[PDB]
């Protein structure tokens, strides 16, 4: 078990740059690109809004497979 456990720790440490999971990146880009969409304001503003909102499917499906309500956690996670 120590070899099967540390093996995950090995790859995590081997890369000196780590990213938080669980839907943090998809929500952070959704809120940031929402305000960045106003920096263009012609056409792509609708495309950027749809591109950023499309990232919410990743944290949504993680909650569905976990039996928890996705409409709650994903909405609460974005508000935080």
């Amino acid at each position: 078990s120590l070899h099967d456990s540390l093996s995950v720790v090995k790859r995590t440490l081997e890369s000196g740059n780590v990213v938080p999971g669980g839907g943090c990146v998809e929500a952070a880009l959704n809120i940031y690109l929402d305000n960045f969409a106003t920096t263009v304001g012609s056409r792509e503003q609708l495309a950027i809004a749809e591109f950023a909102a499309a990232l919410l499917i990743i944290p949504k499906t993680l909650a569905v497979n976990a039996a928890k309500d996705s409409s709650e956690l994903v909405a609460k996670l974005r508000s935080y």
């Binding site: 106003t38 304001g41 012609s42 056409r43 503003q45 609708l46 409409s71 709650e72 909405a75 609460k76 974005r78 508000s79 935080y80």
Partner: protein, 100 residues
């Protein structure tokens, strides 16, 4: 007629419709859960009024509405849609008025 009967007026022609939809998007940020996406859908449902005004008059719904979402988000709440010359503008100066 309604100008004399009602002395309380709000800027129309897309002005008030955007301000109501503007603030409710910010109010939905404080509310978490399904009610957040429902209020966001309500504010998105308020966008059909200024949309159809541009589509029925021949104006471009993609450019004018997006440009309307810009200047209105810049701190001026009175920007409407000019029905004479296509552009975004203040209907309080253009005198498009409806009672509250």
């Amino acid at each position: 007629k309604r100008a004399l009967q009602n002395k309380l007026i709000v800027a129309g022609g897309g002005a008030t419709e955007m301000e109501v939809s503007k603030c409710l998007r910010d109010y939905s940020k404080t509310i978490a859960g399904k009610q957040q996406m429902i209020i966001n859908a309500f504010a998105k449902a308020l966008e059909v009024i200024p949309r159809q005004l541009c589509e029925n008059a021949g104006f471009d719904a993609i450019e004018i509405l997006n440009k309307l979402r810009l200047a209105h988000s810049k701190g001026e709440k009175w920007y409407g849609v000019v029905f004479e010359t296509e552009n975004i503008g203040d209907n309080f100066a253009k005198f498009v008025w409806e009672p509250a």
